[model samples]
Target: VNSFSGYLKLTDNVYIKNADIVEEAKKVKPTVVVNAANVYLKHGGGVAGALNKATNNAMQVESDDYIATNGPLKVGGSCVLSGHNLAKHCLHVVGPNVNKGEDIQLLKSAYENFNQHEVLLAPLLSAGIFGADPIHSLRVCVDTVRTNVYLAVFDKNLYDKLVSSFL
Candidate 1:
């Protein structure tokens, strides 16, 4: 897998990696893992599915409860799950389904709304099944994370494009 790391404006370290996110999670052992989920928290596809399976559906249960109590999560909204398989915490956010500039703002909101942390593991929000531009998604993540951020990309081509863009 290809990997790159550097400092960004709002983060201490930002990583772009082409690797299995679950394996990377085990290796990085971040304080938290953020899921790119829908409002219904369906863990059937994309990053949410992988995270859900890794955590043994703990995230799905928490998300269901959150939605039941608080209504559906907005585009920029989020909920947390603890004692999961991959990390000490998990954050679930509903990413936009289409590539509008709104996605960038929503992503920023999700990051800001998350409790501040030292290390965070996240996917390229809205970039895969959601169809947002990968580069733009990466920019939003790097711009919003307060500390270290690791971005996992399952697509090697996308990963290569990101690395080249940075270079």
Candidate 2:
């Protein structure tokens, strides 16, 4: 039950929380867990792996099915899939590969795509292997949070950095 705290607040109804994503995802409900996925919708490694692993590969199967049916996603596009062990649903978004350029637009659109979910558990999109700077990622993340959000940060170092950013 990680609730809102003063330091975590990014804006009204939005916040950042440093927590283990796998653990959190195991019990989170009534919120759509966001996945920073590749355009192919493959749940390999990073946050995508964690979520898929937590669900014991259940999501990967569904993800594969989704890809098989809908084809690959374009950058900044999104899709919703049913959850396995946890979460009511999952919102998968394709963020940019970064200063590969156009990162801001893609990243912003990625977060903006979470509109269908009333409560979102989001990660720092494009801040991982896709290569956006964590500092810049948080800025884009904070900017697009419209619904109530719990930005579930996974890395302790990055967590500390994000927690300290607002300081």
Best by lDDT: 2
Off by over 4 Å in 1: 1-12, 99-104
Q: lDDT tens string, model 1, 35-127?
A: 887777778876778777887887778778877888877887777767376777777767777754454557667667544666677777777
User: Model 2, range 1-167, lDDT digits (tens) per residue?
Assistant: 43334327767867777776666666555357788888887887888888888888998899989999999988999999986666778888988987566556677888788776777777888887788888888787667767787777877788888767765
What are the per-model C-alpha RMSD values against the true structure? Answer: 4.2, 2.5
Query: lDDT values of the candidates?
Result: 0.70, 0.77
> Which stretch of 10 consecutive residues in model 1 shows the poorest summed lDDT?
1-10
CA shift at 57, candidate 1, in angstroms? 2.5
Model 2 global lDDT (CA atoms, 0 to 1): 0.77
Per-prediction TM-score, please?
0.81, 0.88
Clashing pairs in 2: none
The clash count of every prediction, one per candidate, is 0, 0
Q: Report the number of the highest-TM-score candidate.
A: 2
